[PDB]
């Protein structure tokens, strides 16, 4: 039994709805959807061999006669990011998963590069369309952007970090291999 999932990748802006599809080459008695957490744990989202289930902003519908299932996510949150698997059936047969990435809506961007101590450079408060490139130099280290959520303040922000033990290296030149916003604040 074959299990195809669509799409393979999904970038969204938070707020957007999206649908993950799962097709299967045969009749099934069980179908499950999962989410995998960063450290490897599969979280059960739904058991639905047929019909509809709702839980918070997630929904699932399994049209068993037509051998497919939809996983519907309403108003994606950054916290929805990760890999979603579809499995059917005592063993389960897993699909290869959909990787979901949900970025924040940064309406108030405030790009800046800071120096931190106790040598590290922080690029922060840019919008989600900005791409942070790696360094061509193997003794300079640049992480990809990631989004944090200061929950209690309804505030989200993107950041990447650069560091190095090259003397040449400094915060002003640190993200040069990247397309920085023009108005970026250098303290």
């Amino acid at each position: 039994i074959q299990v195809e999932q669509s799409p393979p990748d999904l970038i969204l802006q938070e707020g957007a709805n999206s649908t993950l599809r799962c097709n299967f080459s045969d009749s099934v008695n069980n179908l499950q959807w999962f989410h995998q957490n960063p450290w490897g744990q599969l979280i059960n989202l739904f058991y639905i061999p047929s019909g509809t289930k709702q839980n918070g902003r997630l929904s699932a519908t399994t049209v068993a006669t037509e051998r497919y299932s939809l996983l519907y996510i309403s108003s994606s949150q950054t916290t929805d990011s990760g890999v979603y698997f579809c499995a059917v059936d005592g063993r389960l047969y897993f699909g290869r998963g959909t990787q979901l990435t949900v970025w924040p809506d940064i309406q108030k961007p405030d790009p800046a590069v800071y120096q931190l101590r106790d040598s590290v450079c922080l690029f922060t408060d840019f919008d989600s369309q900005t791409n942070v490139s790696q360094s061509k130099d193997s003794d300079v280290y640049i992480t990809d952007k990631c989004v944090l959520d200061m929950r209690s303040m309804d505030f989200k922000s993107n950041s990447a970090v650069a560091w190095s033990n090259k003397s040449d290296f400094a915060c002003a030149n640190a993200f040069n291999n990247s397309i920085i916003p023009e108005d970026t604040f250098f303290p």
Binding site: W39, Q41, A87, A112, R117, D118, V120
Partner: protein, 231 residues
């Protein structure tokens, strides 16, 4: 659903023991292998004490289920391509354990725990934004799949945190590095009472393993770094 150990480093030819305890009442146990680039491959199923099915796995992959439905998997004559996340599930609806990550190496010579440092907020950031970002760096470690968490005033925090999805290579042609950020309000950072810790769980060697080399045996350990609110 429970699995031990969390993580296990071994050497070609050795033996790996993976343990699982299902949800109370469940009588079925399923084992799956999740190898980077292949997704989930079915290995074994046990019900009521007995082996009911096998994926495409040679007999050196062995196991059993105990009368209380707990299960173990024994992988003999270990090979490099046995490295994977091994996942246990129980009972209809299947529920997953956290998995045992197995690494099989040619030798232990390259296992190093991380060095962990915490970098305090820029004063500029505080002026410009009313917010303070602490950065954590874990460097020089191998193997990967560490667990980095932030702690403030004795409690683990999740709000305001962001940790890299993957590590980067230190010589991309190799030990790893990892970063994470914690953001708090500037008021929070300015409180001298406040205590911040970046904690990295590293998975390394155990008693079982033989270490010769001069430096400390790179054992499974927690390496931390800290920062205080402004004095």
């Amino acid at each position: 659903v429970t699995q031990s150990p969390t993580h296990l480093i071994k050497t070609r030819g050795q033996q790996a023991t993976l343990r699982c305890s299902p949800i109370s009442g469940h009588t079925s146990v399923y084992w799956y292998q999740q190898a980077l680039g292949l997704g989930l491959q079915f290995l074994l199923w046990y019900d009521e004490g007995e082996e009911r099915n096998r994926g495409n796995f040679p007999p050196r992959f062995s196991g059993r289920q105990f009368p209380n439905y707990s299960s173990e998997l024994n992988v003999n004559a270990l090979e490099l391509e046995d490295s994977a996340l091994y996942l246990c599930a129980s009972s209809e609806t299947q529920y997953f354990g956290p998995g045992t990550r197995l690494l099989v190496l040619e030798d232990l010579k390259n296992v190093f725990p991380p060095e962990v440092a915490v970098f305090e907020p820029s004063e500029a950031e505080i002026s410009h934004t009313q917010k303070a970002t602490l950065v954590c760096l874990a460097t020089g470690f191998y193997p990967d799949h560490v667990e980095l968490s932030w702690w403030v005033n004795g409690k683990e925090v999740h709000s305001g945190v962001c940790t890299d999805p993957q590590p980067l290579k230190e010589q991309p042609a190799s030990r790893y590095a990892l970063s994470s950020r914690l953001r708090v309000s500037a008021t929070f950072w300015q409180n001298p009472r406040n205590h911040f810790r970046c904690q990295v769980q590293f998975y390394g060697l155990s008693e079982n393993d033989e270490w010769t080399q001069d430096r400390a045996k790179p054992v499974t350990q927690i390496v931390s770094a800290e920062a205080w609110g402004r004095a």
